[PDB]
Design a protein around this ligand. Structure first.
Ligand SMILES: *[C@@H]1O[C@H](CO)[C@@H](O)[C@H](O[C@@H]2O[C@H](CO)[C@@H](O[C@@H]3O[C@H](CO[C@H]4O[C@H](CO)[C@@H](O)[C@H](O)[C@@H]4O)[C@@H](O)[C@H](O[C@H]4O[C@H](CO)[C@@H](O)[C@H](O)[C@@H]4O)[C@@H]3O)[C@H](O)[C@H]2NC(C)=O)[C@H]1NC(C)=O
Ligand SMILES: *[C@@H]1O[C@H](CO)[C@@H](O[C@@H]2O[C@H](CO)[C@@H](O[C@@H]3O[C@H](CO[C@H]4O[C@H](CO)[C@@H](O)[C@H](O)[C@@H]4O)[C@@H](O)[C@H](O[C@H]4O[C@H](CO)[C@@H](O)[C@H](O)[C@@H]4O)[C@@H]3O)[C@H](O)[C@H]2NC(C)=O)[C@H](O)[C@H]1NC(C)=O
Ligand SMILES: *[C@@H]1O[C@H](CO)[C@@H](O[C@@H]2O[C@H](CO)[C@@H](O[C@@H]3O[C@H](CO[C@H]4O[C@H](CO)[C@@H](O)[C@H](O)[C@@H]4O)[C@@H](O)[C@H](O[C@H]4O[C@H](CO)[C@@H](O)[C@H](O)[C@@H]4O)[C@@H]3O)[C@H](O)[C@H]2NC(C)=O)[C@H](O)[C@H]1NC(C)=O
Ligand SMILES: *[C@@H]1O[C@H](CO)[C@@H](O)[C@H](O[C@@H]2O[C@H](CO)[C@@H](O)[C@H](O)[C@H]2NC(C)=O)[C@H]1NC(C)=O
Ligand SMILES: *[C@@H]1O[C@H](CO)[C@@H](O[C@@H]2O[C@H](CO)[C@@H](O)[C@H](O)[C@H]2NC(C)=O)[C@H](O)[C@H]1NC(C)=O
Ligand SMILES: *[C@@H]1O[C@H](CO)[C@@H](O[C@@H]2O[C@H](CO)[C@@H](O)[C@H](O)[C@H]2NC(C)=O)[C@H](O)[C@H]1NC(C)=O
Ligand SMILES: *[C@@H]1O[C@H](CO)[C@@H](O)[C@H](O)[C@H]1NC(C)=O
Ligand SMILES: *[C@@H]1O[C@H](CO)[C@@H](O)[C@H](O)[C@H]1NC(C)=O
Ligand SMILES: *[C@@H]1O[C@H](CO)[C@@H](O)[C@H](O)[C@H]1NC(C)=O
Ligand SMILES: *[C@@H]1O[C@H](CO)[C@@H](O)[C@H](O)[C@H]1NC(C)=O
Ligand SMILES: *[C@@H]1O[C@H](CO)[C@@H](O)[C@H](O)[C@H]1NC(C)=O
Ligand SMILES: [Ca+2]
Ligand SMILES: [Ca+2]
Ligand code: NI
Ligand code: NI
Lengths: 5, 988, 5, 6, 424, 5
């Protein structure tokens, strides 16, 4: 997915 | 009737309207409706949208089927077409005029158009609408020409209508239900009776004269959702009816003061209505809860009491339909459908206080209908749809006989004067017939669909039918109920018990608490009392698994559950009379909701079990405080229903998991012993008698109700067999056990001693989705040290700070610490001062011990602004530096002191951006952070000054450093992801 | 995975 | 379109 | 033998030969002796008696236990009264006693086959869904207790539990060695006597029967297609009933199934065809005129192209000239069309916007055509067979006439008027 | 349309 916080 | 136009100028005083029924026509009449004349009746299919050209005295009309616009003079002689055989018109609805233009709205093209009024030229679109434009008008003084008002000198009492009649040009009239007096200027109220005929969505008032078809005895009551019954009060001129959410609505006969009067019941929607006009009370049925209840009309504050309920006996309410009351005689009558293995289909009677239940008529009564009463003749009338007949019988239960037969589906029934009125849903007819042997049949209305109950509005004198409650006003505090013989019995609203005075009310203090998935309900332990001993906990968002009580403080605790809506999971409390609704536990509820609730009344500790997908926790919450602690955390075992006992200081819970068992442990979930592990599959509920120390549990997998002593040993069978399919919850009160059965939909009561064979006695019957039962009594929750074995937690929490846990044989309690480490004195709590772990969770900082078996929090959760991301700890000052992410574009670096002392986080640097890493150099006292938004690693002093840039990387994260060797390491997770090393100055 | 209604 | 408005 | 509460009938189906023959025995007539809502059924082949448990119908049949011959020619009411929510009925052929379950009272009752000695066997049951008698024991299943229990047949004593904690319990039966030789009847003594169906009757005799759409020939052995029956049309199906009210057999294979929204029907007696019109406001394929034989063969779509939005609203067949007059209705105008049977010829004979003919009948004897109008100017209108020389028979005192009929012997026009509630 | 059931 997204490697965000 | 669709169109309508007026010409109130003194000469004309005429009104025009259009009708598009069969034989469509446009009619002219005087403004008082006298000189009715049809002006156009040829070449019209769907007339609509009339409008008058005042200067020329022409009436413009429109047809949506033939698609034309036309006009003619007031007699319809000089017809002309302005728009005809033209494709602009699709489905024109309304029309208006101004000067030399006609504006009309079209429902097909959904646009407003304009054209010349004489030949239809110069067509143009005024505006386009996303919705169909229905009405249109042109506001201008030219559209309201001035004229003399002949009504100025008129003295008409209510209405002065203009008229085309030459001598006066006006006529006096009066509203619906009034008489034009012989003087022809005044009007008097008509006191004659009339018949209210409620339909599926409307209630009409029609005259008892069959030759009158106007349906204007009163202003119709529109907007009815599901009309079945109607009720009236001749004094105060009010009409009453029920609505779906469980409310009663009220409106006067003149159409004013329409309002929601009072809520009826929280458990469902009411069906029937009966009003006592002498004592000013209304009785209604609730087929959802299968009860009959009364609401007070006299005072300003409403009081409601459930009179009769379904207790499983034949003398009771099975499925009530309609009520009839005799205020003078003190008797109440209702027709009842039967229940399986319970009440039969019958016509029953009782006193209006709920006592002296009696069965009058039973037999061929399938598909019963509303009962009605002839108070003068003292006879009951009812309809039987399954046989298509109307039957009559005396109020004592004799002389049953068929009066009217060969009906299709009677729905309404009322008897007034010497005639009987009934509305037949099939045959779509309202019909009148003599009450004496049912001859001389007369039809009032026909071809009226959706017929429902009937009632006659008439003037009733309470002075000529006085009873006990009217002879003794203000005798009862809340509710007065008449009783046969001229007596009266006072009553209290649901949740209150009558005081020994017999005139005053006090809250219930001894009753059972029954929890179901839809609601939580309370019943008095006196079986003869059908009243609700608690304001029901019902409404949206209620899905109750278990309920517990705090008798001393007067609270009921219950846990909701939902596998879809997360916010509807938690623990709630409320007073037995409503009052202080409160959320107790809402944060951290597992995927499965709270599965058990146990309240320690001695210590004020609330024990509950929350279940996650592959594990479960047992937790304590101290009431009225934020202290929450996890006691036991297991995965192979699954505690579900937990009970607490302050007297012996033990915790018991059922498992029903892969290894079913009933466990025993101390008040802190330590010293876990197993009581019963053989012959147990699905224990769903535990119970205890404080005076004998026996654990009572139920098992629906074995259809078992059994008991075992608190010390363990033999398991004794109390109830067994196929007649107990699904016992779900159990409690022990006195010498009896009380359990709920889901399949049988009953609350049972039987002796607690094993080996008894007496059949259980049903408390309530036909309750859906039973979940548990609980006793609300002082004897069940003692507080004196004499019987609680001197529980240390009674005396000011035993001196502990957070939690007080008493031990079965010790005189001193083990103080529990919610957060921090227990002090040297054994009662105070302080910060851990140990090596532990910290992490961030959304807008908070949380701690965690390295021991997985240690459930105590090193320090209390610290709340911050924004979203904490990265953490690092400074040993010298006991502070932690953390980044906060705000609005995805800005960020802060803040620190909070771990010395406590009411310390709060404060900011060191702002306006950075997304920052996902912190590393503190304990030697040089510099903070290294990775600014992701600005794409650099930056270093600043401990005080937040002299910030400097180290290096620029694509996507930085997770900085670590080693000052003793002068190297720092970080991770770049952009393209060509790698771990980079540089000196603390950023070189090499 | 456990109760509802 | 049906000329009834309801 | 099987009961269908949807059709409210008791039917018989053969399983002896290669071809399956079915017939309706008892149907829901007006009298209480008929079938109201059949739940269970028990048979006594050796004596030619049939027993079934029946719920009531409003103003019609009461809830009862009934007996009849297996050919359905002698209805009887055995027990009535406290029979609300009756369950299945089982018969003990040995002792000749019936057993029922009454859910409302939660009891299992017993009574003789002749309607005498009714008495309660088992008390305090919750939902006795099924029961069966074998030997000296009675087995019943309770849906709410979730138990299967065995009790003595002479009294509810000596209860024994066979299974428990079993959900969704339903009816019960005992698979045992029923012998076709110890019990005999007329049909067993006389095999292949009847052509299609043999039904035994009391006294050791037998009565022949035929499948739906067939009736006994005067020889008493053969079957022939029905010649005189009424064609009743409804939205879900088209059904045929005998014109003599004693016969409850379906005189025609019912036209039903997916796609049937029948509005009107008409008959072609000489060729043996039934014409009907389907109507769907959504699916354009389910609009048109179809025909079928009364025995269910040779299905055919007669008219399928050019149907308006409002669909076909009336069909009338000219049996003399082979013309099929039908009314094709659009949103704002209506057509009257002719189709010649077994030809492609089709033409329009009248288009009207203000009027709306809906139901149409034809009389080749007088060479006239009649239709009923329920538009803004309700009327009954007559015209020649080419719809060309029109006159109004009724123009006042008529609102929404949705049916017409011709006498053909007295020259009268009958019509039904549901807005004024009369037949004139 | 009249009867579409
Ligand atoms: C339009 O096309 C459709 C497309 O299918 C055709 O169905 C229809 O053609 C046919 O119309 C004739 C009209 O006479 C029908 O013939 C009649 O059938 C009757 C039933 O026959 C059955 O039962 C008899 C019982 O005795 C049996 O013998 C037959 O073998 C059959 O099983 C029949 O009773 C009747 O006989 C009369 O007329 C005969 C003329 O030769 C005489 O011999 C006889 O004595 C008696 O007077 C007749 O044969 C035919 O069924 C029908 N087609 C089909 C397949 O059904 C076309 N016509 C129109 C405009 O609808
Ligand atoms: C407002 O306007 C309306 C319409 O004029 C009036 O309504 C009528 O009022 C009279 C007098 O109250 C009613 O007469 C009473 O009729 C009763 C029986 O009703 C049936 O039969 C009458 C025809 O006779 C039908 O119209 C009606 O629909 C019923 O089918 C009688 O039982 C009454 O008799 C009683 O009083 C008389 C006189 O004292 C005694 O001799 C008798 O013993 C008995 O006690 C009475 O005759 C009439 O029914 C009403 N019609 C309507 C529409 O209901 C109001 O009077 C008027 N009010 C005012 C203020 O002007
Ligand atoms: C968490 O916090 C909640 C409040 O948010 C606490 O709930 C309160 O608990 C107290 C317990 O004492 C309740 O007070 C009690 O109310 C009883 C009923 O009062 C009514 O009736 C009396 C008598 O007619 C009237 O005088 C009064 O005005 C009310 O109409 C009283 O009978 C109790 O009196 C007894 O205790 C008091 C001291 O509290 C003595 O002075 C008396 O002599 C007598 O011994 C008592 O007053 C209170 O109503 C609750 N409030 C709410 C909002 O529910 C919880 O207790 C707390 N949690 C825990 C675990 O402690
Ligand atoms: C998580 O953290 C964000 C940012 O600090 C915070 O906004 C959330 O708390 C609440 O979220 C609500 C929904 O946006 C909002 O209505 C409410 O004001 C807000 N509280 C504060 C203090 O702003 C946090 N949510 C969760 C689930 O913890
Ligand atoms: C409104 O419509 C009328 C026609 O009904 C227009 O009058 C015509 O205009 C044209 C163009 O100027 C002339 O050639 C004709 O002689 C006019 N008369 C007629 C009867 O055709 C008029 O111009 C239109 N006005 C507007 C503003 O739309
Ligand atoms: C019915 O409604 C009317 C209008 O609201 C009430 O009549 C007046 O209402 C106003 C505003 O509340 C008051 O200031 C007046 O004192 C009222 N006058 C009278 C004569 O009552 C009326 O009170 C309402 N009646 C009921 C019982 O609902
Ligand atoms: C509880 O409710 C009562 C009555 O509404 C109110 O007076 C009281 O302040 C409430 N107490 C609390 C603590 O909510
Ligand atoms: C309780 O646990 C303690 C510590 O494991 C143990 O010494 C003791 O024997 C256990 N039993 C009781 C009830 O004291
Ligand atoms: C990073 O980049 C810009 C340009 O150097 C700088 O001005 C800004 O302050 C930094 N952070 C943000 C908020 O973009
Ligand atoms: C009618 O049906 C029969 C039996 O299926 C068949 O033999 C015959 O050919 C069919 N006739 C037509 C015209 O399709
Ligand atoms: C048929 O219409 C004609 C005119 O075309 C008329 O003269 C004649 O009277 C009408 N015939 C009948 C039978 O009405
Ligand atoms: Ca149109
Ligand atoms: Ca079970
Ligand atoms: Ni009904
Ligand atoms: Ni049943």
């Amino acid at each position: 997915x997204x490697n965000x916080x | 009737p669709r169109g309508l136009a007026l010409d109130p100028r003194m000469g004309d005083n005429v009104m025009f309207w259009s009708d598009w029924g069969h034989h469509p026509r446009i009619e002219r009449a005087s403004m008082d409706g006298t000189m009715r004349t049809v002006i156009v009746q040829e070449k019209i299919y769907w007339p609509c949208g009339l409008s008058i050209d005042y200067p020329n005295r022409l009436i413009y009309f429109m047809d949506a089927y033939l698609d034309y616009i036309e006009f003619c003079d007031y007699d319809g002689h000089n017809r002309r077409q302005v728009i005809a055989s033209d494709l602009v018109l699709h489905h024109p609805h309304a029309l208006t005029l101004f000067e030399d233009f006609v504006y009309w709205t079209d429902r097909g093209t959904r646009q407003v158009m304009q054209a010349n009024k004489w030949h239809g030229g110069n067509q143009s679109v005024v505006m386009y609408s996303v919705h169909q434009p229905l009405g249109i008008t042109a506001i201008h003084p030219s559209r309201q020409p001035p004229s003399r008002n002949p009504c100025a000198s008129a003295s008409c009492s209510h209405l002065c209508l203009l008229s085309a009649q030459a001598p006066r040009h006006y006529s006096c009239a009066c509203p619906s239900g009034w008489n034009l007096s012989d003087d022809s200027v005044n009007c008097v109220r008509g006191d004659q009776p009339f018949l209210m005929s409620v339909r599926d969505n409307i209630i009409f008032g029609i005259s008892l004269d069959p030759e009158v078809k106007s349906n204007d005895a009163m202003v119709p009551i529109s907007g009815i959702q599901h009309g079945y019954d109607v009720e009236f009060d001749d004094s105060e001129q009010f009409i009453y009816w029920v609505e779906n959410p469980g409310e009663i609505h009220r409106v006067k006969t003149d159409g004013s003061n329409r309002t929601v009067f009072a809520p009826l019941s929280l458990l469902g929607s009411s069906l029937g209505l009966a009003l006592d006009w002498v004592s000013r009370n209304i009785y209604y049925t609730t087929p959802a809860s299968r009860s009959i209840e009364v609401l007070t009309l006299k005072g300003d504050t409403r009081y409601g009491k459930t009179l009769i309920a379904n207790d499983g006996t034949p003398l009771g309410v099975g499925f009530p339909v309609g009520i009839a009351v005799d205020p003078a005689r003190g008797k109440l009558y209702w027709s009842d459908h039967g229940t399986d293995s319970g009440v039969p289909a019958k016509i029953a009677s009782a006193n209006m206080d709920g006592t002296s239940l009696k069965i009058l008529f039973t037999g061929n009564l399938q598909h019963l209908e509303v009962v009605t009463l002839d108070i003068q003749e003292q006879k009951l009338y009812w309809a039987v749809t399954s046989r298509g007949v109307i039957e009559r019988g005396n109020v004592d239960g004799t002389e049953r006989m068929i009066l009217v037969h060969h009906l299709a589906h009677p729905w309404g029934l009322v008897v007034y004067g010497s005639f009987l009125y009934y509305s037949d849903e099939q045959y779509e007819v309202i019909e009148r017939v003599d009450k004496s042997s049912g001859n001389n049949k007369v039809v009032l209305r026909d071809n009226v669909p959706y017929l429902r109950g009937l009632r006659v509005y008439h003037r009733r004198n309470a002075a000529d039918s006085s009873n006990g409650c009217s002879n003794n006003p203000n005798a009862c505090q809340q509710i007065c109920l008449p009783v046969p013989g001229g007596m009266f019995s006072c009553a209290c609203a649901s949740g209150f018990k009558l005081s020994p005075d017999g005139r005053s009310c006090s809250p219930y203090n001894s009753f059972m608490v029954v929890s179901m998935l839809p609601a939580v309900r309370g019943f008095s332990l006196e079986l003869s009392d059908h009243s609700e001993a608690m304001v029901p906990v019902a409404g949206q968002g209620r899905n109750v698994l278990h309920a517990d009580v705090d008798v001393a403080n007067g609270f009921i605790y219950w846990c909701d559950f939902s596998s879809s809506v997360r916010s509807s999971n938690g623990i709630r409390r409320i007073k037995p009379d409503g009052s202080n609704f409160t959320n107790v536990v809402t944060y951290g509820i597992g995927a499965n909701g709270i599965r058990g609730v146990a309240l320690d009344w001695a210590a004020g500790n609330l024990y509950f079990t929350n279940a996650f997908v592959y594990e479960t926790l047992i937790e304590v919450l101290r009431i009225n405080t934020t202290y929450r602690r996890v006691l036991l955390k297991v995965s192979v075992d699954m505690p579900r229903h937990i009970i607490v006992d302050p007297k012996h200081r033990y915790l018991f819970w059922a498992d029903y998991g892969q290894k079913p068992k009933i466990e025993r442990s101390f008040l802190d979930c330590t010293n876990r012993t197993v009581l019963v592990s053989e012959g147990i599959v699905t224990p769903r509920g535990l119970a205890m008698d404080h005076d004998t120390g026996y654990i009572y549990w139920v098992d629906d997998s074995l259809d078992l109700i059994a008991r075992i002593h608190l010390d363990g040993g033999e398991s004794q069978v109390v109830r067994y067999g196929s007649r107990y399919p699904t016992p779900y919850g159990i409690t022990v009160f006195g010498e009896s056990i009380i359990w709920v059965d889901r399949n049988l939909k009953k609350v049972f009561q039987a002796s607690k001693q094993p080996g008894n064979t007496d059949p259980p006695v049903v408390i309530r019957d036909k309750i859906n989705l039973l979940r548990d039962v609980t006793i609300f009594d002082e004897h069940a929750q003692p507080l004196s040290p004499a019987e609680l074995n001197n529980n240390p937690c009674l005396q000011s929490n035993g001196g502990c700070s957070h939690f007080c846990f008493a031990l079965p044989e010790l005189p001193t309690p083990r103080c529990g610490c919610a957060f921090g480490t227990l002090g040297n004195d054994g009662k105070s709590c302080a910060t851990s001062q140990e090596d532990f772990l910290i992490y961030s969770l959304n807008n908070s900082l949380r701690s965690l011990h390295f021991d997985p078996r240690d459930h105590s929090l090193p320090f209390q959760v610290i709340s911050v602004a924004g979203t904490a991301i990265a953490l690092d700890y400074d040993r010298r000052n006991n502070r932690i530096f953390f980044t906060q992410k705000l609005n995805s574009l800005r960020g802060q670096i803040s620190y909070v002191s771990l010395y406590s002392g009411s310390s709060s986080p404060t900011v060191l640097l702002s306006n950075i951006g997304v920052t996902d890493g912190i590393a503190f150099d304990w030697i040089n006292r510099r903070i290294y952070y990775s600014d992701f938004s600005n794409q650099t690693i930056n270093s600043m002093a401990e005080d937040g000054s002299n910030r400097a840039v180290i290096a620029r990387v694509s996507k930085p994260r997770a900085i670590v450093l080693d000052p003793c060797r002068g190297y720092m390491y970080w991770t770049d997770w952009g393209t060509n992801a790698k771990i980079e090393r540089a000196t603390l100055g950023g070189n090499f | 995975x456990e109760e509802x209604x | 379109x049906x000329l009834x408005x309801x």
